[PDB]
Write a protein that binds this ligand. Structure first.
Ligand SMILES: CC(C)CCC[C@@H](C)[C@H]1CC[C@H]2[C@@H]3CC=C4C[C@@H](OC(=O)CCC(=O)O)CC[C@]4(C)[C@H]3CC[C@]12C
Ligand SMILES: CC(C)CCC[C@@H](C)[C@H]1CC[C@H]2[C@@H]3CC=C4C[C@@H](OC(=O)CCC(=O)O)CC[C@]4(C)[C@H]3CC[C@]12C
Ligand SMILES: CC(C)CCC[C@@H](C)[C@H]1CC[C@H]2[C@@H]3CC=C4C[C@@H](OC(=O)CCC(=O)O)CC[C@]4(C)[C@H]3CC[C@]12C
Ligand SMILES: CC(C)CCC[C@@H](C)[C@H]1CC[C@H]2[C@@H]3CC=C4C[C@@H](OC(=O)CCC(=O)O)CC[C@]4(C)[C@H]3CC[C@]12C
Ligand SMILES: CC(C)CCC[C@@H](C)[C@H]1CC[C@H]2[C@@H]3CC=C4C[C@@H](OC(=O)CCC(=O)O)CC[C@]4(C)[C@H]3CC[C@]12C
Ligand SMILES: CC(C)CCC[C@@H](C)[C@H]1CC[C@H]2[C@@H]3CC=C4C[C@@H](OC(=O)CCC(=O)O)CC[C@]4(C)[C@H]3CC[C@]12C
Ligand SMILES: CC(C)CCC[C@@H](C)[C@H]1CC[C@H]2[C@@H]3CC=C4C[C@@H](OC(=O)CCC(=O)O)CC[C@]4(C)[C@H]3CC[C@]12C
Ligand SMILES: CC(C)CCC[C@@H](C)[C@H]1CC[C@H]2[C@@H]3CC=C4C[C@@H](OC(=O)CCC(=O)O)CC[C@]4(C)[C@H]3CC[C@]12C
Ligand SMILES: Oc1cc(NCCCCCN2CCOCC2)ccc1Oc1c(F)c(F)c(C(F)(F)F)c(F)c1F
Ligand SMILES: Oc1cc(NCCCCCN2CCOCC2)ccc1Oc1c(F)c(F)c(C(F)(F)F)c(F)c1F
Ligand SMILES: [Ca+2]
Ligand SMILES: [Ca+2]
Ligand SMILES: [K+]
Ligand SMILES: [K+]
Ligand SMILES: [Mg+2]
Lengths: 391, 279, 75
């Protein structure tokens, strides 16, 4: 009747039916023989038992509990019990665990994700493992940032293990998990991707072949963009020449913000820059790792190196008080007064334009709501600027 | 003596669980047919349920302590007769016990808020054990007479140790977690089954007007279950009433597999020592 | 001009990848290959569609001869 099509259902039904049938039939036979007597002794050996009692007797015998509260007393009963002991014990030993195993194959991570009005969220997919997840979370939810509200939603294809479960528990509020895959255009709707701030894509840096990983990531990107045209995407890549393939996607608008990161290019760039001035690589690489202040007493170089690494880099707009001023004047004023180091500003215009360091007179402050970069201990201190009245 | 009042206590739990199920199912259907401050409250409860803050840390530990405390009360009360009358103001117990169940009521409220789908929260093991344990205490304090009904379910709270330990960030590795899960599940199952057998055996069969009762103590019940679960089966002590035998059949179906699959794993996990370490 | 009008014929080894060949398509992993837009436009092609050729050969006498003459040009 087409009711059963899969394999587990068939296996389970077979086992259940055979087991129950055997149990009940043997119980009935014992009932008959015991309630009656042996014929050669003219039925003078009868014992009184109800059918339910017979059912109870066999379950104790098969399980090998052997309580001994009730037992067969007739010759036929004992003979049948001997042969059934030879036979049914193997069935009981090798069937019950099978059924217990077959039941309980529940996928713990189905379901969807409800959307909360007024709160943004992101989705992460790719190569997910304990180290990558721990690093990503530890950096992303750090407290030096301004208070954040975004909610992370992972989406992978392999169910997590115990340590990863523990990590999710420790971040019970902001992190949720789902099982699926990006390439399936149902899972995307299941995780409400059509209203999401962005979509990150981690990649396995330690791979056997760099090009296969790039192809897979390109496939994920094209699938996502097919589902939804306009959405911010951030991706890691392993070869420089493969970056061109991204521009072939008809809707990859980098101008409105869609950034790709090429690890090889950046690594070689840092090294080459160090070839000019030593230590520049290790000095730059600390400006992107969020770390807090650490204080020690023993007078070793660590006592200064940690004060060095406590810094990060942020960005914020400038107060209206700096309209007609030169970049050097603004920078030195910010330094001396606010104890902030303002390294570079972008130039607002019809086209995007960022200048690193500017001599006076060449470029006065445009004051067109200009954006300036900074270095400070935490995001809070940057807001000292943009408030600069005549206080 | 007198008229038995056991029906009331069983009634109070049943009406709550079903009545709660009805209203939630109805309200969802009503919204279907007819066709933020609330978010902030949910967020605060979720922070409190977890151990994010200091205030979160203290609350979880109290649940850990009081879960054990409620269980100890159950052991003491097992010796008393099944149905009895007592004065609330006179007894030290039933006053400490009343205090504990107040706390469990509140912690249920906070846990309720933070859930996502209220229906699948309602149909959860911790929620159902709270449903079947809490209201009877209030009913008893109102009626001035008590029945040892379903109170053995308090042992099921031991499951949550594996989680209210991880929340405090104590278990981190992948072996301690396994070991703790196995131990807690095993012990909880054993104790709750013993409690149920105790209840059914000391009480009689209902339709036979409680004329076939057999007298047993809680420790004897525990011992009986251990002997049965290990498939030894001495003939000295065995269940006699119909309900007892009926339960014992299904427990034989399940617990045997539980024991035979769990005990070797625990024995193996313990004792994984480095026999040649040192300095 | 642009390169959107260049005729292209491609061969696939796994049918389910067909969703990626076009952008203004209604991708879905349930419809069979003979309904996807790339196939009905005569742009994609997979060997999987030739499994049906067995049974058709058995019933009708000598279809296989006709196909070869029409395709390989001389049999
Ligand atoms: C069900 C199928 C498999 C046939 C099984 C046949 C035998 C295993 C059994 C069935 C009936 C039994 C007989 C039923 C009754 C009697 C009478 C009994 O003697 C008396 O009760 C007293 C003398 C009398 O009744 O005439 C001696 C055993 C005997 C022959 C039994 C011998 C064993 C028999 C032949
Ligand atoms: C192997 C399975 C399928 C069948 C096994 C059958 C045996 C258990 C039965 C069949 C015939 C029975 C015999 C039939 C008759 C008698 C005579 C009987 O003698 C008397 O009690 C005297 C009075 C009388 O004949 O009834 C003693 C038992 C005995 C040997 C019986 C013993 C049990 C036997 C061998
Ligand atoms: C674990 C599950 C899958 C199977 C369990 C089997 C047995 C434990 C139960 C299931 C149904 C029960 C039966 C259901 C109904 C009846 C009719 C009942 O009849 C009466 O009470 C009438 C008595 C009279 O008229 O004198 C007697 C018990 C009996 C045979 C029960 C005997 C015990 C049975 C076989
Ligand atoms: C399938 C599951 C869910 C329930 C299996 C049991 C039930 C089908 C009930 C229905 C009728 C019951 C029976 C009704 C009456 C009796 C007689 C009663 O007689 C005695 O008290 C005998 C002495 C003794 O048991 O110590 C024993 C239990 C028994 C067989 C009951 C056993 C349990 C039964 C089979
Ligand atoms: C750590 C937690 C889980 C407790 C684990 C141990 C309990 C299972 C044991 C420890 C001490 C035991 C108690 C020690 C002594 C007594 C007194 C004893 O008194 C009687 O026999 C009273 C008889 C009567 O008057 O009716 C009844 C059992 C009881 C409460 C015992 C119940 C079981 C207890 C609580
Ligand atoms: C497992 C779940 C579904 C709960 C099942 C509970 C029933 C097995 C119990 C609960 C209430 C019991 C009833 C409570 C009280 C009575 C009255 C009792 O009769 C008397 O009190 C006096 C009769 C006389 O005068 O002889 C007969 C049994 C009966 C119907 C009980 C039969 C068994 C019942 C239905
Ligand atoms: C489905 C699960 C969760 C609960 C299963 C409960 C059954 C095992 C209980 C419920 C009601 C019980 C019945 C309630 C009353 C009776 C009548 C009782 O007989 C009498 O009261 C008098 C008999 C006489 O006149 O001699 C025999 C047991 C029996 C059938 C009980 C057998 C066991 C039953 C079916
Ligand atoms: C392994 C660590 C956690 C200690 C565990 C202690 C328990 C196993 C002890 C503590 C108090 C003991 C109880 C104290 C007093 C009694 C009453 C005593 O009463 C009788 O002698 C009744 C008649 C009889 O059975 O001989 C029976 C044992 C019992 C329940 C004891 C059972 C074993 C208990 C619960
Ligand atoms: O067991 C038997 C039962 C009966 N029914 C009537 C019993 C009347 C009892 C009257 N009494 C009044 C007072 O007390 C209460 C009852 C008939 C023959 C039997 O003999 C069998 C046998 F010997 C045998 F070998 C096999 C087999 F296994 F080989 F198949 C059987 F199936 C048998 F049925
Ligand atoms: O077990 C029961 C106990 C009682 N009161 C016991 C005290 C009786 C009076 C005092 N005693 C008189 C003489 O003896 C000594 C002192 C009443 C109904 C019961 O019936 C249940 C039932 F039938 C059932 F099926 C289930 C379950 F299956 F759902 F679990 C239950 F939980 C039940 F409680
Ligand atoms: Ca810092
Ligand atoms: Ca497509
Ligand atoms: K055994
Ligand atoms: K025995
Ligand atoms: Mg949440």
């Amino acid at each position: 009747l087409n009711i059963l099509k899969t394999s587990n259902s068939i296996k389970l039904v077979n086992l259940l039916s055979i087991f129950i049938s055997t149990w009940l039939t043997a119980a009935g036979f014992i009932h008959l023989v015991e309630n009656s007597g042996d014929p050669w002794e003219n039925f003078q050996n009868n014992q009184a038992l109800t059918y339910w009692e017979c059912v109870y007797l066999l379950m104790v015998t098969m399980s090998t509990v052997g309580y001994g509260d009730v037992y067969a007393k007739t010759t036929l009963g004992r003979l049948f019990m001997v042969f059934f002991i030879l036979g049914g014990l193997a069935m009981f030993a090798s069937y019950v665990p099978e059924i217990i195993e077959l039941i309980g194959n529940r996928k713990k991570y189905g379901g969807s994700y409800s959307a909360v009005s007024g709160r943004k969220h992101i989705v992460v997919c790719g190569h997910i493992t304990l180290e990558s997840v721990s690093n990503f979370l530890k950096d992303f939810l750090h407290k030096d940032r301004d208070d954040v509200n975004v909610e992370i939603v992972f989406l992978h294809n392999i169910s997590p293990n115990l340590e990863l479960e523990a990590l999710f528990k420790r971040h019970f509020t902001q992190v949720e998990f789902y099982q699926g895959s990006v390439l399936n255009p149902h899972d995307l709707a299941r995780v409400k991707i059509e209203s999401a701030d962005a979509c990150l894509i981690l990649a396995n840096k330690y791979c056997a072949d760099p090009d296969a990983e790039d192809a897979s990531n390109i496939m994920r990107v094209i699938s996502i963009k097919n589902y939804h045209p306009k959405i911010r995407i951030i991706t890691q890549m392993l070869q420089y020449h493969n970056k061109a393939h991204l521009l072939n996607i008809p809707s990859w608008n980098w101008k409105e913000g869609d950034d790709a990161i090429c690890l090889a290019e950046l690594k070689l760039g840092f090294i080459a820059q160090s070839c000019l001035a030593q230590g520049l690589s290790t000095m730059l690489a600390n400006l992107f790792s969020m770390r807090s202040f650490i204080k020690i007493e023993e007078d070793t170089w660590q006592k200064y190196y940690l004060e060095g690494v406590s810094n990060e880099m942020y960005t914020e707009y400038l107060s209206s008080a700096f309209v007609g001023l030169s970049f050097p004047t603004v920078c030195e004023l910010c330094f001396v007064k606010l104890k902030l180091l303002m390294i570079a500003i972008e130039y607002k215009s019809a086209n995007r334009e960022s200048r690193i360091l500017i001599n006076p007179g060449n470029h006065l402050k445009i004051q067109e709501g200009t954006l300036g970069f900074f270095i400070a201990s935490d995001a809070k201190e940057v807001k000292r600027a943009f408030f600069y009245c005549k206080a | 003596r007198g008229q038995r009042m056991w029906w009331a206590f069983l009634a109070s739990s049943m009406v709550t669980f079903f009545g709660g199920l009805f209203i939630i199912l109805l309200w969802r259907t009503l919204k279907y047919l007819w066709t933020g401050w609330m978010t902030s409250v949910k967020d605060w409860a979720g922070v409190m349920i977890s151990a994010q803050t200091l205030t979160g840390r203290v609350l979880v530990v109290l649940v850990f302590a009081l879960s054990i405390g409620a269980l100890v009360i159950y052991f003491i009360d097992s010796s008393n007769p099944i149905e009895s009358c007592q004065n609330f103001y006179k007894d030290f117990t039933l006053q400490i016990d009343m205090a504990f169940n107040v706390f469990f009521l509140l912690y249920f409220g906070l846990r309720f808020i933070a859930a996502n789908d209220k229906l699948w929260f309602w149909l959860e093991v911790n929620s159902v054990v709270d449903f079947f344990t809490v209201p009877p205490v209030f009913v008893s304090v109102y009626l001035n007479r008590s029945w040892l009904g379903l109170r053995f379910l308090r042992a099921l709270r031991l499951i949550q140790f594996s989680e209210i330990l991880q929340f405090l960030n104590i278990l981190k590795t992948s072996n301690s977690i396994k070991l703790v899960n196995l131990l807690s599940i095993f012990i909880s199952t054993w104790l709750t089954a013993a409690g149920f057998i105790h209840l059914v055996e000391n009480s009689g069969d209902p339709w036979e007007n409680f004329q076939n009762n057999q007298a047993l103590t809680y420790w004897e019940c525990v011992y009986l279950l251990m002997v049965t679960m290990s498939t030894v089966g001495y003939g000295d002590v065995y269940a006699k009433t119909t309900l007892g035998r009926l339960f014992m059949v299904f427990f034989i179906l399940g617990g045997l597999a539980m024991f035979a699959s769990y005990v070797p794993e625990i024995i193996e996990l313990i004792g994984n020592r480095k026999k040649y370490g040192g300095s | 001009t642009t390169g959107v009008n260049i005729p292209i014929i491609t061969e696939l080894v796994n049918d389910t990848n067909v969703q990626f060949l076009d952008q203004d398509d209604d991708d879905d992993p349930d419809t069979e290959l003979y309904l996807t837009q790339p196939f009905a436009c005569g742009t994609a092609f997979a060997v999987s569609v030739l499994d049906s050729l067995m049974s058709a050969t058995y019933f009708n006498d000598n279809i296989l001869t006709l196909i070869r003459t029409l395709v390989t040009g001389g049999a």
